[PDB]
């Protein structure tokens with residue numbers, strides 16, 4: 540029998556979600572189980588849990604991000620630059636690999652979208668416009684990014700049946716950690732400025748592994764190793780959301796743990 544919206548709200552209340560919270564969810568819909576009206580039931584429950592003054596922030600990215608097609612080039616290759624669609628924030632579908640719930644979040648009425656096509660975040664609430672902008676190329680997940688403002692607003696990370704590798708907020712820890720040999724990447728994104736399509740090439744921290752030893756694809760990255768060490772040492776509210784084992788993590792605490800984690804293992 541499918542979970543109802545009221546049942547999910549009660550579970551979110553037991554986990555510790557309160558009205559007015561700023562919550563960032565990472566969801567495995569298969570772990571949640573069948574819902575009354577599909578994935579929209581969980582979206583409605585999250586919005587009711589945080590209340591009218593609460594906020595939802597999701598890393599949704601973009602289904603058609605030309606990341607690999609422009610990686611390692613000082614400019615988009617000719618075939619990519621001439622035909623790739625421009626990133627239209629209010630019309631770009633989310634990246635499916637990060638969870639099918641994100642396409643329901645980004646299409647919710649009133650949801651805002653950041654202008655960074657590869658690191659695009661979706662936000663719902665009174666602080667959505669403040670979270671969503673600015674999000675310029677070269678500041679994907681570090682300072683001046685929605686994650687940075689999320690960390691400065693007592694944000695909570697809601698892992699619903701998702702693995703420790705999904706903690707997007709830990710990309711901020713990699714960005715500011717004073718360690719040696721941090722990996723950087725160069726790619727190009729097609730932006731939409733005043734209806735005109737503009738290619739922007741930038742360099743930023745490698746979000747697929749900040750260090751060489753964490754960047755192998757077979758393959759736990761620095762995010763997974765930090766999150767596993769954190770969850771093995773920290774008391775965190777845990778309980779069911781639907782059929783999924785869930786965690787409500789203090790974002791500022793796990794990021795401070797991540798900075799100390801990286802700086803303790805690598806010289807400056």
Ligand SMILES: CC(=O)SCCNC(=O)CCNC(=O)[C@H](O)C(C)(C)COP(=O)(O)OP(=O)(O)OC[C@H]1O[C@@H](n2cnc3c(N)ncnc32)[C@H](O)[C@@H]1OP(=O)(O)O
Nearest residue numbers: 565566567568569570637638639701702704705706707762
């Ligand atoms: C450090 C970083 O930044 S990592 C980047 C950010 N990544 C994240 O946030 C990921 C968080 N989520 C996770 O980690 C999860 O474990 C995942 C997404 C990787 C895998 O979990 P899954 O449950 O297998 O994927 P998902 O959440 O999308 O749900 C899949 C179900 O939704 C279904 N579905 C897909 N689209 C729709 C749709 N429009 N309508 C209804 N159902 C849909 C799929 O068919 C599937 O159902 P099925 O069992 O019948 O095949």
